[PDB]
Write an enzyme that holds these catalytic residues in place. Structure first.
Site, PDB file in Angstrom:
ATOM      1  N   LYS A  37      -5.159   8.144   3.274  1.00 29.09           N
ATOM      2  CA  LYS A  37      -4.362   6.924   3.161  1.00 29.09           C
ATOM      3  C   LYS A  37      -2.889   7.240   2.915  1.00 29.09           C
ATOM      4  CE  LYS A  37      -5.412   2.257   1.669  1.00 29.09           C
ATOM      5  NZ  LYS A  37      -5.565   1.374   0.488  1.00 29.09           N
ATOM      6  N   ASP A  38      -2.613   8.259   2.099  1.00 27.57           N
ATOM      7  CA  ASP A  38      -1.248   8.695   1.852  1.00 27.57           C
ATOM      8  C   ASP A  38      -0.628   9.339   3.081  1.00 27.57           C
ATOM      9  OD1 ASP A  38      -0.890   9.482  -1.671  1.00 27.57           O
ATOM     10  OD2 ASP A  38      -1.920   7.828  -0.679  1.00 27.57           O
ATOM     11  N   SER A  67      -5.330   4.945 -13.577  1.00 31.31           N
ATOM     12  CA  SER A  67      -4.613   4.088 -12.645  1.00 31.31           C
ATOM     13  C   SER A  67      -5.103   2.649 -12.748  1.00 31.31           C
ATOM     14  CB  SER A  67      -4.765   4.602 -11.213  1.00 31.31           C
ATOM     15  OG  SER A  67      -4.421   5.971 -11.131  1.00 31.31           O
ATOM     16  N   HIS A  86      -1.912  10.123 -15.422  1.00 33.52           N
ATOM     17  CA  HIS A  86      -3.227  10.745 -15.360  1.00 33.52           C
ATOM     18  C   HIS A  86      -3.922  10.763 -16.712  1.00 33.52           C
ATOM     19  CE1 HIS A  86      -2.381  11.438 -11.333  1.00 33.52           C
ATOM     20  NE2 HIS A  86      -2.095  12.727 -11.329  1.00 33.52           N
ATOM     21  N   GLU A  88      26.947  -0.017  -2.150  1.00 35.71           N
ATOM     22  CA  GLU A  88      25.807   0.015  -1.251  1.00 35.71           C
ATOM     23  C   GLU A  88      24.831  -1.111  -1.587  1.00 35.71           C
ATOM     24  OE1 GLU A  88      24.790   1.440   1.722  1.00 35.71           O
ATOM     25  OE2 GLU A  88      26.970   1.541   1.486  1.00 35.71           O
TER      26      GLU A  88
END
Ligand SMILES: CCCCCCCCCCCCCCCCCC(=O)OC[C@H](COP(=O)([O-])OCC(O)COP(=O)([O-])OC[C@@H](COC(=O)CCCCCCCCCCCCCCCCC)OC(=O)CCCCCCCCCCCCCCCCC)OC(=O)CCCCCCCCCCCCCCCCC
Ligand SMILES: CCCCCCCCCCCCCCCCCC(=O)OC[C@H](COP(=O)(O)OCCN)OC(=O)CCCCCCCCCCCCCCCCC
Ligand SMILES: CCCCCCCCCCCCCCCCCC(=O)OC[C@H](COP(=O)(O)OCCN)OC(=O)CCCCCCCCCCCCCCCCC
Ligand SMILES: CCCCCCCCCCCCCCCCCC(=O)OC[C@H](COP(=O)(O)OCCN)OC(=O)CCCCCCCCCCCCCCCCC
Ligand SMILES: CCCCCCCCCCCCCCCCCC(=O)OC[C@H](COP(=O)(O)OCCN)OC(=O)CCCCCCCCCCCCCCCCC
Ligand SMILES: CCCCCCCCCCCCCCCCCC(=O)OC[C@H](COP(=O)(O)OCCN)OC(=O)CCCCCCCCCCCCCCCCC
Ligand code: HEC
Ligand code: HEC
Ligand code: HEM
Ligand code: HEM
Ligand code: HEM
Ligand code: HEM
Ligand code: FES
Lengths: 74, 147, 241, 379, 144, 380, 49
Positions: free
Chosen positions: F227-228, F205, F201, F271
């Site tokens: 959207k999230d 971005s 921040h 894994e």
């Protein structure tokens, strides 16, 4: 916001200070410390002490009355 | 003060006293006759101690490194050839071997059909590798330290 | 009886702030526990390796653990088997379960003695007063048979027969095994059993006290320096009139 | 150019600890706040080193704790500083709240309310941590206080079956108490971050209660070395309390294993709960006792609306100073009474103590404030 | 676990009643024997894995509680292993105590062929073929 | 009258970060994965919190406690398989997050990238000890293999591995301290993610074009909030279909056996999200070289900002480096496949080729391709 | 315990005020012919007879 520079507004005040490297860290420790300790405790002892005095009185009386109550009646 | 408190907190995560008493468990005597394999419970594993004679050691000295399933010759793994130390754990299922059996007179796995070599190699069988040998230090010959 | 007698303060060798335990007394008290108290009482949380470096040497504790049978197992054929003990083994239980202990002790369960001076008000003073405070019951009260009068037991009715008298055991170091001497030795051993870290704690506390007595005036001096730049400050006022 | 004011991570540290303006006249009591944070870190650090060996199972919890003391290298040290650090945490917490009450620090209402949320969280954390070693006192104290929490009609019995995870206190309760006791100090740490954030919008209070903006000093180097000295004094007290009297504040009955059929003659919580316990049994009704405990701990939240003086601190209010010290004396008496059994004359002393506690906080201090206001010729 | 899945509660209680379970210790301080309850787990045939290895000719019979989740292929592997017991091919020597199952890795299992035609009588009039028994026990092991 | 959104301090903080945050208008579906990683972290905290209410870290009572969770606790199978498949979904989200950062030049946010690298290290460690926790055969043997591999660094390897074990092998002290470390580590991950968001921040971005997006910026609410929400609900669809329909395809079956120190499995593989690194540690027949190669593979992922030689940020306009990037992605895929395979012909040579191609693409070929593209665009 | 009727009459003849713990004995049992209770001694868990 709350930083140095805009905290308040002081006018006409002069302050004098020394270095810590040329004054003593304990300047007249006992000879000026003992009278201020007596002065502070003389100012606060009549506000602080008597509630704890009556705490000790209630503590002793409660212990004595409890040991009397556990004692039987001849 | 900082070094003492940090060293104490680091040393708290080291191995505790019950683990130390359960890690150097076996301090062997010489109560084993010449040729007998005997079992111990060391570190949660069967540990085999067997006395050997130099006739069998010279007989097993004719095993080549090139034709071994896992290459490990029969001369370097023991400093005292008359005392042999094995781990009695199969690499296939986790069973126990029983010595002096087979055409070679080696160890035999009764779970499995596999005939281990008397030195601890997988002679015939589908176990992918041999029987492991731990670390061991030599005091006077009555007493051997394992660890 | 609801009122209960309190144990007095006995002048123990380890009573002081920097005074450690007496390890010879720990050794004699362990001999007392092994010969007498281990018949009914357990110390499941103490092992034979704990005695090494405190009151017995390595070969001594090795022999003292080797003279004990321990039920090892399971065998390759699938069964339990008796074996000679070793240094990693704990002290053996007198009974396999608490209910057999109740059956052999007239219902009462003899407690595990690993923490018994940390679990009683008085501690080793209480243990000494319990072992040395056995007496005939006073009049008025007539207790049940198989119980014993002890004024220090809470309720004054103990299910433990008095195990201590003169020459109840021998001492290998040549000490007169009286009633009070045996009780004092076993109380010292019980204090060691509850706190095996006691002497090391007191040594670390002594180092702590010396280091803090060094460090406090120096840090106070640093505070007084960096604040004595401010505590000698003088202020003035210049009003223009 | 400089990283202290332009780097986005060092800017926060500079704004909170380096160039932060602080009052030049604050006494040693303010150091207690930083001490609380240090205790939190100490507890967390020591708690982590208890968690590398603790086994949360009713068969192997007491045994695991004994293995920590007897077989883990310096494990007795870590366990006893965790216990006495919980005690020192509550000592510093009590003096922090007393500083808040005396010097009028509850007028920062958001900071005060995040404080009482922190107090609730640390009381629950210490409760479940005390249940964790699974001795006699842990099992029986948990059973007693949760069974009296069950006193609400039609709701409390389902809540206590949900909390216990079964008919009574068992292995499910022990394991979920271990999980809750581990995870609650991190919500406590985040809430302390929010506590400090809500403080720093307005600055600290001073003992005189006046506007200290006429004379403020940076936090560094003054209060840095002052809080360092307070940390050293606290570590003296804590290490004396561990290395010399490791179970003076403790209870010996927690050293037996938890026998569910062995009810002790006395059942007590730890000392820092005891006063609320003595407010709990001061009322012979279970709903009344539990709700009175809730009011006895939430009267701190009610405190900022009980301020009547035109002044802020008690430095220039002698009658309210007397009432405050009577309140502290009454709190000490309540702690002693909660330590004591429920017999004569402890029941009437506890009843009068709780009545005087609620009367002093609720009624007598606003009356004293308006009396001193009238006495100073301003009302 | 069998109530609401395969049996009713009285049926599973009667099934557990025929079980004879170790419990105790009693007031006299020793083990005793009781009929089983609904909260009793399925009985182990052996007290410890060493007796299991001793009785079953060396090899350890594993716990079939996750055996469909601990084998690749799932219950296809169980069905193929139970129905795949055949004679060894030419050349390979099979040791006594071992049986040739090509689906077992190594092709030399220590398990005798445990099922055949009519090895148990079903209570619902089902033909007790070996494939039916294998499919039923594979479905049960998938449930388990 | 004031606005409580912009004057109340924590409301001011959440208004700065979540409501009135100027975000680029053109960020694609690859930008949903940071919030997916955050919500999957929260799912891991909640499901592990409910798992630790019945788990008992003790070698006699760990596998049995896991079965007690599965078969006796109400919906304990649901929470347990939610936790395991959420770890798998978490690493899927991490891989796509780092791939977004690599493709679109987001590593020039250097401190954000390095805080991310620290997050990735912490998450891989946390999931490793979490996989150790159920105390199956594969858990114990994977822990044994990883720590004996760690014991190859000179003069401090044996001391460090016996200090990590709490003994001379993996035993109950290791299990208890691994439970403690697995419980604590995601909170340090959460704090480092707060620092990650702090640095991002401050620096703003990035868009898929790689251009300065301050000419066209939109508020976070309601656009990227909805959207999230759509991305979170899609991730819940994938996670819940993989819990309820295929619960045992991303694990291995022989973790459903109890741990046996005597018996060893023939295929000892970790894994799936470790397997590519596993291939690298088998790409060298030297243990110290393998350990060093693993840690410097993740460290050259950290060193990636220093290798940027092009004058364009994103790979939107750079097709040669796009081809090299997808060659690297497929190379990571076959590294995963080779790590899932035994050490046999022909997997040694394929694993060695995959490792040398991976390091050659990251180190050498991509900056040379950037230089070539700059020459081809008449820059220099 | 399946009790006896003489014990029932004796315990129903017990005065409420003379008991140490105030609790009604008729309301102690639901069915007057049987006794169902915790067999735990309140000291430490000794088994009574
Ligand atoms: C004794 C004889 C000498 C004497 O009386 O000196 C007078 C002198 C007072 O005279 P003063 O001129 O007012 O000097 C005080 C200064 O103005 C200002 O100095 P100060 O007293 O504010 O110092 C800062 C304050 C800072 O204190 C703290 O930060 C303490 C915080 C933790 C308190 C405890 C927490 C746990 C509580 C559990 C209950 O320190 C103290 O209160 C005592 C520090 C002692 C350090 C070790 C000295 C040896 O006494 C002291 O300074 C007290 C310390 C010595 C006793
Ligand atoms: C996180 C904070 C945890 C608490 C920090 C204080 C710990 C003090 C302590 O116990 O230190 C131990 C040390 C004595 O160490 P000791 O083991 O007795 O001897 C070394 C021989 N190898 O004693 C000391 O170092 C002296 C006491 C120092 C107290 C802290 C000062 C800052
Ligand atoms: C005991 C120490 C008593 C003491 O020192 O009292 C004096 C001091 C008041 O002094 P002050 O008016 O600030 O003047 C400065 C110069 N004398 O007194 C103080 O500074 C005391 C201020 C309060 C700090 C002590 C708090 C004690 C615990 C309170 C518990 C209750 C809190 C709420 C719980 C619910
Ligand atoms: C008019 C007073 C004159 C006093 C003169 C004293 C001598 C003066 C010459 C020498 C100088 C000595 C030092 C001077 C100190 C400061 C000045 C002073 O003396 O102040 C007096 C002091 C405060 O003054 P003020 O607030 O006006 O008093 C109201 C009384 N309540 O007030 C006091 O000290 C009185 C305090 C009384 C407190 C009584 C508390 C009783 C109740 C305690 C209950 C505790 C809980 C019990 C349990 C409850 C449940 C059962
Ligand atoms: C995945 C399948 C292919 C997805 C796809 O559609 O790729 C093509 C797409 C092109 O996007 P772009 O060129 O930016 O846009 C042109 C106009 N929109 O290209 C992209 O969307 C590029 C971004 C893809 C990011 C995810 C792919 C890589 C995932 C694994 C990365 C592993 C990195 C290393 C991790 C361990 C260290
Ligand atoms: C020659 C002309 C280009 C190719 C033929 C296509 C002609 C189309 C003509 C009409 C135009 C249609 C629309 C065009 C759209 C945009 C342009 C385009 O798609 O170009 C083709 C494209 C990129 O081409 P470009 O990057 O310019 O070529 C490199 C130059 N040095 O893509 C390509 O060029 C294809 C790249 C293929 C790369 C194959 C790599 C094989 C090896 C991969 C190994 C991976 C695993 C490694 C494992 C190691 C260990 C074993
Ligand atoms: C078998 C006869 C025992 C011998 C030998 C020892 N103890 Fe014992 N002890 C025994 C019983 C049955 C009980 C329970 C008593 C009861 O009425 O419940 C005890 C109790 C103790 C206690 C606890 C007392 C308490 O208040 O909790 C202690 C501290 C104790 N015993 C000490 C002790 C010592 C030091 C012994 C060796 C000399 C010893 N006991 C031997 C049974 C037996
Ligand atoms: C005693 C003769 C048994 C009977 C009855 C059943 N099984 Fe068994 N089984 C037995 C042994 C001794 C072994 C070990 C074999 C070895 O090589 O070690 C087994 C093994 C199994 C396995 C495991 C196979 C694997 O790959 O791990 C399974 C799945 C199995 N047995 C199934 C099974 C079923 C379904 C049975 C009831 C019809 C059954 N067995 C009976 C011994 C015996
Ligand atoms: C969890 C324990 C707590 C911690 C870690 C904590 C932390 C702090 C810190 C670091 C400060 C700043 C330093 C200081 O001024 O002393 C502070 C101040 C303060 N705290 Fe707390 N606190 C805690 C509990 C509480 C509680 C329970 C209350 C409410 C009663 C409270 C109310 C305050 C107030 C009012 C201040 C302002 C000080 C002033 O300006 O006078 N705190 N706290
Ligand atoms: C995340 C941090 C913490 C962890 C992991 C933790 C862990 C533990 C563990 C494992 C125990 C049991 C071991 C023992 O009893 O010696 C315990 C006990 C305890 N904890 Fe904590 N704890 C933490 C924080 C705290 C805090 C902040 C407090 C104070 C409120 C606290 C108070 C206690 C108390 C009072 C005990 C009981 C001590 C006793 O046995 O008497 N813990 N803790
Ligand atoms: C612990 C897991 C992680 C979490 C929770 C996390 C969280 C986030 C969040 C919430 C964002 C902003 C939204 C977005 O752009 O998707 C973000 C962006 C970013 N993260 Fe992470 N991250 C994680 C791992 C990583 C790693 C491992 C890296 C380094 C390879 C990284 C580097 C970045 C970068 C460069 C951005 C900015 C991309 C852009 O602005 O377009 N993150 N992360
Ligand atoms: C602080 C939060 C967390 C807690 C309390 C926690 C707790 C647990 C517990 C108790 C287990 C054992 C249950 C089981 O294995 O069936 C476990 C397993 C596991 N955890 Fe976590 N965990 C947390 C966060 C994470 C995170 C962030 C990851 C990585 C994405 C993770 C990955 C795993 C894995 C892979 C397993 C093994 C699952 C299995 O094989 O059954 N955990 N966790
Ligand atoms: S299981 Fe023993 S060699 Fe095959």
């Amino acid at each position: 916001g709350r930083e140095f520079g805009n905290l308040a507004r002081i006018r006409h005040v002069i302050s004098y200070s020394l270095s810590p490297f040329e004054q003593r860290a304990f300047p007249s420790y006992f000879s000026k410390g003992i009278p201020n300790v007596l002065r502070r405790t003389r100012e606060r002892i009549l506000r602080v002490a008597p509630p704890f005095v009556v705490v000790y009185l209630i503590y002793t009386w409660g212990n004595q009355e409890f040991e009397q109550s556990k004692r039987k009646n001849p | 003060a900082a070094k003492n408190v940090v060293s104490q907190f680091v040393s708290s995560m080291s191995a505790s006293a019950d683990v130390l008493a359960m890690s150097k468990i076996e301090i062997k005597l010489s109560d084993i006759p010449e040729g007998k394999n005997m079992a111990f419970k060391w570190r949660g594993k069967p540990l085999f101690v067997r006395h050997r004679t130099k006739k069998e050691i010279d007989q097993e000295a004719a095993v080549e490194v090139s034709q071994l399933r896992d290459p490990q010759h029969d001369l370097d793994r023991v400093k005292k050839p008359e005392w042999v130390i094995l781990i009695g754990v199969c690499t296939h299922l986790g069973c126990v071997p029983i010595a002096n059996a087979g055409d070679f007179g080696g160890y035999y796995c009764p779970c499995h059909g596999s005939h281990y070599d008397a030195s601890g190699r997988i002679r015939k069988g589908p176990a992918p590798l041999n029987l492991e040998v731990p670390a061991y230090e030599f005091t006077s010959d009555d007493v051997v330290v394992v660890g | 009886s609801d009122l209960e007698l309190h144990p007095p303060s006995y002048p123990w060798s380890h009573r002081g702030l920097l005074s450690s335990l007496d390890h010879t007394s720990i050794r004699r008290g362990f001999q007392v526990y092994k010969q007498v108290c281990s018949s009914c009482h357990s110390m499941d949380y103490v092992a034979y390796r704990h005695l090494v470096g405190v009151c017995y040497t390595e070969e001594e504790a090795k022999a003292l653990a080797e003279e004990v049978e321990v039920q090892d197992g399971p065998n390759d054929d699938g069964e339990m088997f008796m074996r000679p003990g070793k240094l990693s083994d704990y002290f053996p239980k007198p009974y396999p379960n608490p209910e057999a202990a109740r059956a052999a002790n007239n219902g009462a369960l003899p407690p595990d003695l690993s923490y018994i001076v940390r679990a009683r008000h008085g501690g080793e003073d209480y243990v000494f007063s319990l072992l040395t405070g056995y007496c005939e019951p006073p009049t008025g009260v007539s207790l049940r048979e198989g119980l014993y009068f002890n004024p220090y037991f809470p309720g004054q009715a103990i299910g433990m027969a008095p195990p201590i008298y003169t020459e109840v055991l021998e001492y290998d170091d040549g000490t007169p095994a009286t009633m009070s001497q045996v009780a004092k030795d076993v109380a010292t051993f019980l204090r060691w059993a509850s706190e095996p870290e006691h002497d090391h704690r007191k040594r670390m506390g002594l180092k702590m006290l010396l280091m803090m007595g060094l460090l406090l005036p120096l840090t106070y001096a640093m505070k007084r320096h960096k604040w004595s730049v401010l505590k000698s400050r003088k202020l003035a006022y210049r009003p223009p009139k | 150019t400089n990283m202290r004011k332009t780097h986005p991570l060092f800017k926060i540290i500079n704004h909170s600890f380096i160039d932060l303006p602080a009052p030049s006249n604050i006494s040693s009591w303010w150091n207690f706040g930083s001490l609380l944070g240090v205790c939190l870190m100490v507890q967390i650090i020591t708690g982590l080193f208890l968690a590398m060996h603790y086994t949360s199972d009713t068969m192997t919890a007491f045994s695991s704790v004994t293995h920590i003391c007897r077989d883990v290298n310096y494990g007795w040290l870590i366990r006893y500083m965790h216990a006495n650090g919980a005690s020192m945490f509550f000592i510093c917490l009590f003096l922090h709240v007393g500083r808040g009450l005396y010097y009028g620090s509850y007028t920062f209402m958001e900071t005060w309310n995040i404080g009482v949320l922190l107090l609730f969280a640390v009381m629950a954390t210490a409760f479940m941590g005390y249940v964790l070693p699974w001795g006699q006192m842990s099992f029986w104290g948990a059973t007693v206080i949760t069974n009296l929490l069950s006193a609400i009609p039609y709701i409390g019995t389902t809540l206590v079956e949900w909390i216990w995870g079964g008919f009574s206190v068992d292995k499910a309760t022990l394991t979920r108490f271990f999980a809750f006791h581990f995870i609650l100090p991190f919500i406590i740490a985040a809430l302390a971050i929010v506590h400090l954030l809500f403080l720093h919008e307005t600055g600290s209070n001073n003992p005189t209660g006046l506007n200290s903006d006429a004379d403020k000093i940076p936090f560094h180097p003054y209060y840095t070395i002052k809080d360092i000295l307070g940390i050293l004094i606290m570590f003296l007290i804590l290490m004396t309390l561990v290395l010399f009297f490791p179970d003076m504040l403790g209870d010996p009955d927690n050293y037996m294993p938890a026998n569910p059929l062995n009810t002790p003659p006395h059942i007590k919580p730890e000392w820092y709960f005891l006063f609320a316990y003595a407010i709990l049994r001061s009322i012979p009704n279970k709903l009344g006792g539990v709700l009175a405990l809730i009011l006895s701990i939430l009267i701190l939240a009610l405190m900022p609306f009980l301020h009547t003086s035109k002044q802020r601190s008690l430095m220039f209010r002698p009658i309210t100073q007397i009432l405050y010290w009577i309140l502290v004396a009454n709190l000490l008496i309540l702690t002693w009474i909660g330590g004591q059994p429920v017999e004569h004359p402890f029941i009437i002393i506890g009843q009068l103590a709780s009545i005087s506690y609620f009367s002093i906080i609720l009624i007598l201090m606003p009356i004293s404030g308006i009396i001193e206001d009238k006495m100073l010729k301003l009302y």
